[PDB]
Structure formats: C-alpha cells, structure tokens
Amino acid sequence: HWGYGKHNGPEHWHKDFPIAKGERQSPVDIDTHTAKYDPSLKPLSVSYDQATSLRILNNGHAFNVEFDDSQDKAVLKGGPLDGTYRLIQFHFHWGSLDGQGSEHTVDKKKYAAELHLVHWNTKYGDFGKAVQQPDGLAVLGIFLKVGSAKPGLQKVVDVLDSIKTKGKSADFTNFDPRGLLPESLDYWTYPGSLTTPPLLECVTWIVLKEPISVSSEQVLKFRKLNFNGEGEPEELMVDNWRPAQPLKNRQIKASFK
Numbered sequence: 001h002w003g004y005g006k007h008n009g010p011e012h013w014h015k016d017f018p019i020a021k022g023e024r025q026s027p028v029d030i031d032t033h034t035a036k037y038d039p040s041l042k043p044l045s046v047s048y049d050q051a052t053s054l055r056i057l058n059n060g061h062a063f064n065v066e067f068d069d070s071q072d073k074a075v076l077k078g079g080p081l082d083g084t085y086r087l088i089q090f091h092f093h094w095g096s097l098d099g100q101g102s103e104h105t106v107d108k109k110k111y112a113a114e115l116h117l118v119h120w121n122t123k124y125g126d127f128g129k130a131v132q133q134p135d136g137l138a139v140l141g142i143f144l145k146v147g148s149a150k151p152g153l154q155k156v157v158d159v160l161d162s163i164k165t166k167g168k169s170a171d172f173t174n175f176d177p178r179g180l181l182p183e184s185l186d187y188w189t190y191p192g193s194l195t196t197p198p199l200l201e202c203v204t205w206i207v208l209k210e211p212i213s214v215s216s217e218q219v220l221k222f223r224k225l226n227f228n229g230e231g232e233p234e235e236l237m238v239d240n241w242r243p244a245q246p247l248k249n250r251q252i253k254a255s256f257k
Ligand SMILES: CC(=O)O[C@@H]1[C@H](O)[C@@H](O)[C@@H](O)O[C@@H]1COS(N)(=O)=O
Pocket: 059, 061, 062, 063, 064, 091, 116, 118, 139, 193, 194, 195, 196
C-alpha cells in the first residue's frame, strides 16, 4: 500500500487517493510575508491539564501517543476554532538528516521534524465522523530544530526501543503533552487536510511560529525506528513527511504581526 519509499511515496498517492490533488491539501509552504494578521482571532486555548495518555504505537508510518478521548480531558479551543476539539493522539514526522523532516515549511525552510497534536471536533461525536466534515479536526503543528535536548520529550524517546517495528505498542500512561509546547502560542492557520492517506480535507491547521529544540541524540533515536514489521528486512523509519502542496485558493492567517 502507501508509504514514503520511491515506489509508494507521496508522488504515487493520487492513484489510490484522487483527493491528493484536491482543493485544500496539506502540508503547504507558509510564506510569512503573504500571511495576513487577523485581529479577529481569539486567543488560542490549550487545556491539557487532565490529559490521559494510554499507549504508544508504531503503525508503520510513524508512532502515535494515544490519549483517552472518551471525555473532554484535553482540549484545544479558541484561535480560529469554533467549539471544542478533543485531543486523540500526537505523532511526529522527521527526516534522515537535520536539514529535512518537517511537513510544513516556513519560507521554504524545512525543519528537522514536526509534531502534530491531533484533535477532533466534539460536535461530531466521534473521530470517524469528524474526518468526514470540513471542520472535523484541528491539528496543532510544532516544528522541531536540533539544538539542546527537550526534557519533556525524553520519556517518548526512552520507550521507542520497545516499539521498534510496525504493529508494536507499549503502555504509555501519565505523559504530559504540555512538556512539548514552546513558550509562545503565536501561530499561522489555514484550512487543509490530513497529510497521509486518506488525505481527507477535514483539518484546520494551527502551526506554531516558535520551534522547540531537541538534541541530536533525541532525533537520532526517532531514526532507529522501523517502517517494517518484526522479522522483516530493516527499513529505517526516516523521511516520513509529505512535501508542501499547492496553496491554491486559500489564505493563511497569522495570530501576530
Ligand atoms: C490523524 C491521523 O490521521 O494521523 C495519521 C497517523 O495516525 C499518524 O501516525 C501519521 O502517520 O500521520 C497521519 C496523518 O495525520 S496528520 N499528519 O494529518 O495530522
């Protein structure tokens, strides 16, 4: 099926998933000098105090840290969002080298990685229903650059040895997503899609201006993961990012001047 190799990578996805060439695809390049400050945007509200992490899973495309979303325990509100969006999982996209790995780019600049905190609009009752709606999901994107270590990331790094291959999962309770946020919540926002098949156009993207720093040792451990299942020839999980797609008829709004 789909992946990030030469023979099944983003260039091929449109054949099985025609929406790949659709009206509102992600990610995009964020041209900082074309984005429009929008003084009408309300403050962004990240409410993660009651967040309940459950499990970490290698799904053969990335790794997901999953949360209990049966109640409003960890939510995103405000900014461009109407109503309440519940945290369901977060994951990363990253490169084989520090100079690439992010999905969104900022004035064409690629970061070493990008964290995605995925939330679904509670008005639609469940995640499966939400992805079929133009405002079903809100994904908070955060760039990673290589610098000093991120202490709040180390617990994730530590457990990767136990989910090396596709299908593996481990208990991952009492992790606090707040440790992954930068100081500033200044952001750009635009209407887009999931960046992997099924590429559904159901996402309000909120991409933070300020990157977090992680250490070389930390990102190196991401790169030791496998796309393949246990017992199969080793394919390192690297460069699991879709490149920037055409902006087409969309505007990127900024929360700041
Ligand atoms: C919400 C979701 O579909 O996440 C999926 C996967 O579970 C995830 O592991 C990763 O591959 O990105 C995907 C695409 O989502 S993303 N990049 O749009 O935010």
